[PDB]
Amino acid sequence: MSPSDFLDKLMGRTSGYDARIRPNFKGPPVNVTCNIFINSFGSIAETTMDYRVNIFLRQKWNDPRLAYSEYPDDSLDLDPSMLDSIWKPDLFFANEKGANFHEVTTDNKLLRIFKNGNVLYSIRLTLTLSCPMDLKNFPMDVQTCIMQLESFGYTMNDLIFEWQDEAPVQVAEGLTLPQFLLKEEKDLRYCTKHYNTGKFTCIEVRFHLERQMGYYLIQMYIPSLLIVILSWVSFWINMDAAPARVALGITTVLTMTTQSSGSRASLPKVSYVKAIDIWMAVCLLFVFSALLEYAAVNFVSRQHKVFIDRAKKIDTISRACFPLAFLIFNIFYWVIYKILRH
Amino acid sequence: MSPSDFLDKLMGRTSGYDARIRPNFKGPPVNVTCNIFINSFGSIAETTMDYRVNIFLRQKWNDPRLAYSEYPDDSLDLDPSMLDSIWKPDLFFANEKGANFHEVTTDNKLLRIFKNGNVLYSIRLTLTLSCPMDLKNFPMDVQTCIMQLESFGYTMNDLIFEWQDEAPVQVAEGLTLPQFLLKEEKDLRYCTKHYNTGKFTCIEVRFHLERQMGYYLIQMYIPSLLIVILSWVSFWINMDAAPARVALGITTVLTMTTQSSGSRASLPKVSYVKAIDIWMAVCLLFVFSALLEYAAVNFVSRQHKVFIDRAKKIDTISRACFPLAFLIFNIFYWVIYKILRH
Amino acid sequence: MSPSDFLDKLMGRTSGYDARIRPNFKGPPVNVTCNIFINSFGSIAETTMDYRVNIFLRQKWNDPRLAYSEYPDDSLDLDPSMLDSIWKPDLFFANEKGANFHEVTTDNKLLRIFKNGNVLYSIRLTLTLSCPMDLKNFPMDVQTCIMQLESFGYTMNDLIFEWQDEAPVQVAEGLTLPQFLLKEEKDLRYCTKHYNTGKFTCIEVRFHLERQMGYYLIQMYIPSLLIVILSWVSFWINMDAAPARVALGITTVLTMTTQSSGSRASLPKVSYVKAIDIWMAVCLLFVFSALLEYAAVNFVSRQHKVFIDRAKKIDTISRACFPLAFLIFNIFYWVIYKILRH
Amino acid sequence: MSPSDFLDKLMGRTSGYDARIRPNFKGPPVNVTCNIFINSFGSIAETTMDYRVNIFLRQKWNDPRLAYSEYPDDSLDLDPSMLDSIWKPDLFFANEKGANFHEVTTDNKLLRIFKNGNVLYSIRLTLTLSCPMDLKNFPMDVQTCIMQLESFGYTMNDLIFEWQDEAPVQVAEGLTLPQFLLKEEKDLRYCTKHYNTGKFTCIEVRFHLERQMGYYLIQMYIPSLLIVILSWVSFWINMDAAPARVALGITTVLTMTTQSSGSRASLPKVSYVKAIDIWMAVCLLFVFSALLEYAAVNFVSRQHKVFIDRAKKIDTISRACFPLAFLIFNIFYWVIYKILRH
Amino acid sequence: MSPSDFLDKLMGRTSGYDARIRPNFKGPPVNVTCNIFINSFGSIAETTMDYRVNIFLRQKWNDPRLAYSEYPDDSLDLDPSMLDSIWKPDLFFANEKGANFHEVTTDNKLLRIFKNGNVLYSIRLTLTLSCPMDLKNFPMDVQTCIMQLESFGYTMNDLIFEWQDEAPVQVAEGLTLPQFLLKEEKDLRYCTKHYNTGKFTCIEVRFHLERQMGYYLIQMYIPSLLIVILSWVSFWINMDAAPARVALGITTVLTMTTQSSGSRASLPKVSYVKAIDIWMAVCLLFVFSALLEYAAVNFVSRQHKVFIDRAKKIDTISRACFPLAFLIFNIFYWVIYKILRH
């Protein structure tokens, strides 16, 4: 029979379907099964404490009032324009800060109804979600980004969200991030929100992201080591080259301070000490100690042969003492940051 | 009886409800009770003089025309689509600079009507609110952010906003700020606006925010102290190292000026003196005084043995005089800024 | 009588009111009285040549077709939803670059009708308005920001805008600006626009803003003076300290040039000379002249006792000559910029 | 007769007017006359290759179906709300990147119909238009900004756009630009687009903009000359001041390189050589040559009286040789850039 | 016959056309032919990993229900307002991140129907599309930007997208890019997406972009070479000029490090080594080696005639050894990067 007649016959004023009434108005709660497909992930900014995602959201529920038997086809696709005339759950994202649909040529929405009355709804969304981040162990850190799906208006007597037993989250093939590695394990847990207005269903997903070290090594760790070695070079210069040694010390100190200030150019103003901060503090301490060493040598050398050998002995000791202590610090730093991290 | 019939029977042309007429058209003013739930707080920018918040707003009032007795249920939830057909107050935020609703999958709105005629309306909002800030005592400052709820069109004869006796403001669990600490005490006060058009109800809430010092200590206070100590190092160098001492003085002066200029990189161009400005001024004065000291010593030393001991005595006095005066300044600074602040 | 009946009886198809026809279709022009209330002012950017304001706009006119006598109340408030069914003037802002209404919980609009037929319309607006600025006397400047209200479609035969005799402009209490002081005198003048399409009514308001000097003093004027004094210090160093004196001169010159380049970091690329530019040019000239002085002294001193006293005499003269000429320049600069400004 | 009746009598279902049918459905093409009024011009960014304009657009055409004779008035203004019910051309801007209407208090639109059937339509628009720019002769450049008006859906058999014989483009009085001078001559030319879908009418306007040099002179050209003179100063220093001369050379070289890098901070990454690039290259070459000169002098002077006079003779020759060659370069540069530009 | 009658006679309730039903509801799949015209290309940002395009999209398909014979004209243009009443495919862009239509004066849309029932639909779109980029060989790189057209709701039984046999992609005449060269060969390939909901048609286009080297040569490669030559200059200075040589070495090292840090100012934080990174590493190694050479020479020279000739011999060897090794490195670098790239 004519396709146009069946649609309004089923969902029209003649039938009596009301899209403001739940499938079972007084009865067991509606059970909604959800799965998400991630099409792109990125735009993770520490400063604005947020990340941007683009996902496909699928919802499944049973509506006994939409059961159709007469029509031959087992499964019926429909038109996106008729979504307004069916009941839909009022899902919202609790941690969302921005959202929008897509209307690129048409509404990016799908609807499918089965003979038994099952409904499949798929929609394309773009979300900016908030993610609290811990910045300790900042270079060698693992973050967790959550996404919470909640009901705004229906209590647990009416609506109950659940996860699909197989394949709740799948990621698009070939998706990669410049600064992070997305772990394949996703944690599916139950959250329930309590307010003065009642109890509301909630579901959550946790994503594990590991930062990549190559950029930080090429950028910060290696120039600091170069400045430390440059300061070490001064121990092999003649003690009579006072302007040269003093200029080298001052330049190294100022460069170290500038790099330390610039290492936090793209981070939130946190109030604790990070690993990069410990590293820069130790390197600045070494450079300053080298300058103080030459200062002591110069003070000793003008006290007039006993004073000559004593000042030379300081230079010889510092030539084999500064690299050894820095090597010990590097061993202690890199190990414990592969132990405290885990 | 059928759910669909009751809704239009109560709120339809047949009943005669008009959403443009107040619950008591000529009579005592409508009393509206409000409470807010804060779901996220952040984005506090000194430059743009504003902060961003995301809140849930609940309004309660009594409408005698909506009293229902026949239906069995004590409390009736409804559909968000029918909000257009009920009377709602015209609340607006006086200090608002931007606002938007959420339509992530549906309208984020709730409505509930009770047997007696009481209505509960809940809506999700995102607001950018303006906050005047005082920048004196800038590192050690406590700010106050206000939010004002006012009626645009109804005078006090018609509409009166009030606060709920229990729990007007609650904050979501685990909410934290990177640079601030939100105090638990909130001040509930009465504001009333007077214009040439009449008298209008207003309500206000004040939030107390205390800045955290760790970032400022790691960033500004410690490098300035390092530069001061670096300038102090010059007193232990031989007076004959004129290029070395002059280069050290010039480098310290230029670095101090650059840090002083950069300490106000992310602040509004205010016209008063902040504490950080006093600190940088004192440190620049100390560095310049050290350079002037070596200048005087060099001028004295070339006046040709009496001139030799006098110039050496200046260096010995300045070696125990510059640290003592700076220690006294640090004691006087840090105390009074823990006394004038309170 | 029933409130709902009177509204459509007055403004309905039964009555014959047409919102597309003026109050007097063929007759004397409609006279509209306007007043504005300023709720916030700020966001004055020299680069984007614009400023942002948030105002309440009130319009008053007489409509003889809306005269009501039967109803007892002298003054009738109404609902914002019915604005579409009354005639309203087509006011627009000629200098506007951006605008938006507010829909925070409802439309921020008010309407009131009186027995005689007078209408009061109040609306909340946010406007980004363009302001041509003159940058000469840039630190010590007084700007004027205009706002023009004009009719887009009606000629002077139909619509005539006027200002209210008492209180056209009032400002909200406690409004302050970080970098400017808003003067209390506002200039109310008549503007009329002439085009190839006809004559159109226009009204304008001028606001006087005076820049505050504290920020510029702390930022630019004082470090430049410090660099000049630092260059002056070189006159007291021994003439044999050639590397020290040359390094001091080069560092001062480079620092002066960098500060001069950075003094125009946040301004439009204008093609004339500002006062700050004159100041930096004079300070750079003084620093360069000091370097040229030491250059001449060093050239003279190696010409081999007559050459010894002549070179020393140059240093002694320059020690009392450079501060005196700079003091004279400061006197001439600061006076005339308190005379030419007025 | 009643004003309301005439409007729907002329343009209503009773009359049979169809706004989807052209004035002459099968017949000579519709001829549309256009003129634009420019109210503000600015926001010319080289990086984003675009400029922002705000214009009033006037369209004129004849519709024989709208001819009215009975009504007394020769010319009838109308209401903006009825624009949807008349046929309008489908003008679009081919080079447009962003556009928006204005709804500040009402739609900023005008419509007027005459007895003969002529229609005048005026609308307010804000456009961001794309402008290809040639960056050779970058300081002394003249740009051309185009704006193209085209029909999207109608071929030349149906629609033909033309320019008005008198006053197509007029500019608002007092309009000025910070960095450019708008020439008074505007070029009116005919463009026609050819696609696989057919032939479409197009019209274009070209605006000539000349850059102002004051900013570039104060910013780039003068500090480079100062650095060149500073390097020249080294020729008058004693040849025994090796650290001083070497430090001066290195500082001048590094400063020159930094200024050369910073001269292209706000420009697109083009792949050709600009005039500023030639200038900085020549100045860097002069500074390096001065350093190489002192290097050669120092190498010659330690070859041990014949070697003493030869090295002094090099300094004396370079003291009168470097300024002369730079003066010749300045003469050749500034002339040809006032000849090749024209 | 009257034009208005034919339109609703063909596509009206009287005819029975339903825009929610496919041209052949149960039958062979609908075959859609597509071609795109590119009007502007640009805004390629490595940081935000995306590019902006502005295209015209043409779709062609056959609808047997729209076959018209009676009307004389072979081809009928129509009005954009009636697009809502015809069936249209639900094309979407899978890699899209932002999109918008144009409404500059009217909807920028075209529709044309032929006698046989063929439909041509043309629409103007602006798209921000995502493009994964490989940054190895960063200066000498060739990128590929894809654009994917997919069906959101229809499976392959219903809808099948295909490319036109002649001229699928054409580019507007005179289109150029500042930093890239668009290759004339475009790759047309078949993509099909598989999901848990079914099989969906997809089509893709690949664009090849080659980066231009002029900007990178003028900006990065040449100043680094200048710094290397500047460090080479130190070999010709007297070995007794210890402050001069040490200052030259330190300044060159610090400048090299600053340029290396600044070479990645506008790129994503990738974790691999680029060619520019290899170049800066080699240049920094050469500068440091030069400083270490002078350090060794100074250490050797103070070991007290045998020590005098040995230290001089080191300087003479390094004067002909450093340029030769750097020339060999330049030969090996530039060749293999013209071989590994291809």
Ligand SMILES: *[C@@H]1O[C@H](CO)[C@@H](O[C@@H]2O[C@H](CO)[C@@H](O)[C@H](O)[C@H]2NC(C)=O)[C@H](O)[C@H]1NC(C)=O
């Ligand atoms: C939604 O799922 C819930 C949870 O399984 C269902 O509630 C159970 O239903 C079974 C079957 O009738 C009862 O025997 C249990 O006692 C129920 N348990 C609870 C905790 O309620 C519910 O019936 C489902 N709703 C629908 C419409 O299928």
Ligand SMILES: *[C@@H]1O[C@H](CO)[C@@H](O[C@@H]2O[C@H](CO)[C@@H](O)[C@H](O)[C@H]2NC(C)=O)[C@H](O)[C@H]1NC(C)=O
């Ligand atoms: C809204 O609250 C006000 C304030 O309590 C009520 O006004 C009072 O009402 C009581 C009870 O009728 C009177 O006895 C008082 O004289 C009123 N005081 C004032 C200052 O008005 C008002 O009745 C309430 N409105 C409604 C609809 O309940």
Ligand SMILES: *[C@@H]1O[C@H](CO)[C@@H](O[C@@H]2O[C@H](CO)[C@@H](O)[C@H](O)[C@H]2NC(C)=O)[C@H](O)[C@H]1NC(C)=O
């Ligand atoms: C609007 O104001 C104008 C200006 O006062 C009025 O025009 C005058 O009206 C008076 C009273 O009828 C006449 O005597 C004058 O000759 C008019 N002068 C001019 C210059 O027109 C006008 O009547 C007012 N319109 C309305 C509707 O009140």
Ligand SMILES: *[C@@H]1O[C@H](CO)[C@@H](O[C@@H]2O[C@H](CO)[C@@H](O)[C@H](O)[C@H]2NC(C)=O)[C@H](O)[C@H]1NC(C)=O
């Ligand atoms: C629009 O303008 C065109 C160009 O002038 C008109 O076309 C001409 O019309 C005259 C007068 O009938 C004819 O004699 C010419 O042969 C036409 N020339 C061409 C090239 O077509 C056209 O008639 C105008 N359309 C309207 C509706 O006035």
Ligand SMILES: *[C@@H]1O[C@H](CO)[C@@H](O[C@@H]2O[C@H](CO)[C@@H](O)[C@H](O)[C@H]2NC(C)=O)[C@H](O)[C@H]1NC(C)=O
């Ligand atoms: C759309 O194109 C497909 C592919 O050519 C058509 O499918 C073929 O149709 C021919 C002609 O009837 C058959 O003989 C083939 O067996 C079909 N092949 C396949 C793989 O399906 C299809 O008919 C076209 N649809 C329309 C409406 O023209």
